[PDB]
């Protein structure tokens, strides 16, 4: 079966690491950080990796029941699955699907419904992926809210991510850190079944990132979010499951108003994109541009300069 990539443009697509639209393409030099995300990881033949699932609205969300923590405004959530069934902390995944893959503080809203009378309550809440109480692989996390007396027990509760927050008396832009993985089992275990780290295996080649801007909710946060594959390509590769004729597919970026090729890049079977460039570059593209698969190539194909 012939391999293809969707003909959607960058503005039409969605980030695979947070439920927000894409914005621009960006290439930058890897080094001083390890590119090892667990969302947006998917092979070209349809195999999902890490914490990747298919719905773009279930990224960075949580479901389950809550419990008030004595004398605080904090709540502990016992995690369920997406379909509200029980979560199995013995599944061969790093954490429940859609769980964040970066260290930071995520602000959103906790909502709850009482199955009895159909009454509802919602409160702003914050979750910090970098503290001791963030143990999603164990099924339990913590929320900081504004109320100490409104969320009931044994009821379905859902966390909906909105943005990121930075708390501090200075130290600006020190969080979130998109290339630092959380400890999915807290201080009581090492992460397991992770998606492999990715890096170009070719000097002068850099990764191409699909970049969106996360909303900020408090302070001076880092709102840039790079992903390896748009959520739409993750969905495409899964449905098509076209076998790879090689370890590297060659894509071309086309401006259909002219018919002209703007640049070419390598789509690696493992599920990420490389360009031939040196230094950080915010790519400037026509809004109609789309990627196009041309041919499968070998290990030693040399790319035209982006």
């Amino acid at each position: 079966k012939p391999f293809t990539v969707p003909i959607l443009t960058v503005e039409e697509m969605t980030n695979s690491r947070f439920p927000i639209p894409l914005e621009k393409l960006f290439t930058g030099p890897s080094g001083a950080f390890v590119v090892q995300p667990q969302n947006g990881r998917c092979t070209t033949d349809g195999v999902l990796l890490g914490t990747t699932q298919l719905s773009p609205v279930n990224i960075c969300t949580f479901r389950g029941d809550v419990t008030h923590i004595a004398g605080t405004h904090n709540y502990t959530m016992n995690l369920a699955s997406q379909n509200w069934n029980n979560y199995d902390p013995t599944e061969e995944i790093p954490a429940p699907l859609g769980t964040p893959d970066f260290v930071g503080r995520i602000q959103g809203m906790l909502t709850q419904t009482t199955r009895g009378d159909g009454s509802t309550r919602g409160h702003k809440a914050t979750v910090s992926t970098g503290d001791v109480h963030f143990t999603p692989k164990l099924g339990s996390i913590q929320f900081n809210t504004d109320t100490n007396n409104d969320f009931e027990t044994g009821q379905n509760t859902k966390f909906t991510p909105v943005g990121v927050v930075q708390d501090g008396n200075g130290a600006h832009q020190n969080e979130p850190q998109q290339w630092v993985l959380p400890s999915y089992s807290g201080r009581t275990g090492h992460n397991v079944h992770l998606a492999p780290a990715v890096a170009p295996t070719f000097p002068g080649e850099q990764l191409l990132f699909f970049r969106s801007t996360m909303p900020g909710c408090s302070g001076y946060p880092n709102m840039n979010l790079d992903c390896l594959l748009p959520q739409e390509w993750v969905q495409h590769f899964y449905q098509e499951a076209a076998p790879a004729q090689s370890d590297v597919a060659l894509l071309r970026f086309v401006n259909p108003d002219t018919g002209r090729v703007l640049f070419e890049c390598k789509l690696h079977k493992s599920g990420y994109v490389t360009v031939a460039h040196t230094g950080q570059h915010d790519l400037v593209i026509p809004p109609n541009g789309y990627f196009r698969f041309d041919s499968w190539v070998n290990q030693f194909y040399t790319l035209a300069p982006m």
């Epitope: 390890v34 130290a171 020190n174 290339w179 840039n224 040196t278 230094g279 950080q280």
Partner: antibody
Framework: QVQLVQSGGGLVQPGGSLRLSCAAS????????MHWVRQAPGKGLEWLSY????????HYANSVKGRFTISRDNARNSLDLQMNSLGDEDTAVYYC???????????????????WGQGTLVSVSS | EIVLTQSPASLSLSPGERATLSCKAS??????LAWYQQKPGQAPRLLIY???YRAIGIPARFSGSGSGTDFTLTISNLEPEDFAVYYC??????????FGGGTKVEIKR
């Protein structure tokens, strides 16, 4: 209350060796890469060396490769520059500058050094 | 490596006037160009990062613009303290830093 305080330098006879040091306080040291930069008197800045916070990535300018050695001890919040086989081309003020404010783990690989050292003069005269 | 030329090397302006410094790059470096200020005897001071974002604690009289190759630092109303030397800097050859030749802002009398 972020601070970079340098030590070392001084006078050296042509051919000799020196050791520079930068002591850091007020931030997560292993989260930021550090540079060494020199400014000969009256001229412009010149990049010398870089070492990254956690990845142990090390890079040197072409003029100093083989002669200089950069190093950091993240446990003691220190940064060292071993300078061997100096000459008068190496007479300058030497600065340690951090990559900031955004940590390495944010992927930012652009030009931004928000906190430097105070300066440490190195003179190579006989 | 990519080269950064500032021009001119010297500027003479009256306090209160408006300073316009230029940095030009040999080829494109997108928006990743930072401006520094150096008063003599001191270490450099970061004014502008990403070509147009003021660093933290910088007065609004400093404005940066540009992209690709042609970049411009602008001081709206020159104060007596803003007479120093000004370096542009890029980092396209990661990790190395490359600076410009500097531009000196002299007091005009």
């Amino acid at each position: 209350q972020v601070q970079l305080v340098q030590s070392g330098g001084g006078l050296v006879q042509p051919g000799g060796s020196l050791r520079l040091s930068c002591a850091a306080s007020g931030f997560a040291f292993s989260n930021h890469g550090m540079h060494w930069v020199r400014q000969a008197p009256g001229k412009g800045l010149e990049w010398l060396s870089y070492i990254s916070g956690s990845t142990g990535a090390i890079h040197y300018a072409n003029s100093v490769k083989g002669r200089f050695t950069i190093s950091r001890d993240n446990a003691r919040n220190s940064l060292d520059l071993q300078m061997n086989s100096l000459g008068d081309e190496d007479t300058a003020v030497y600065y340690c500058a951090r990559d900031g404010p955004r940590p390495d783990g944010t992927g930012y690989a652009g030009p931004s050094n928000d906190y430097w050292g105070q300066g440490t003069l190195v003179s190579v005269s006989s | 490596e990519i080269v950064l030329t500032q021009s001119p090397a010297s500027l003479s302006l009256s306090p209160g006037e408006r300073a316009t410094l230029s940095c030009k790059a040999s080829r494109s470096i997108s928006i990743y160009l930072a401006w520094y200020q150096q008063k003599p005897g001191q270490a450099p001071r970061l004014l502008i990062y990403d070509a147009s974002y003021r660093a933290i604690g910088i007065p609004a009289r400093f404005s940066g613009s540009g992209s690709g190759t042609d970049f411009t630092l602008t001081i709206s109303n020159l104060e007596p303290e803003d007479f120093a030397v000004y370096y542009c800097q890029h980092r396209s050859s990661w990790p190395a830093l490359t600076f410009g030749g500097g531009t000196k802002v002299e007091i005009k009398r």
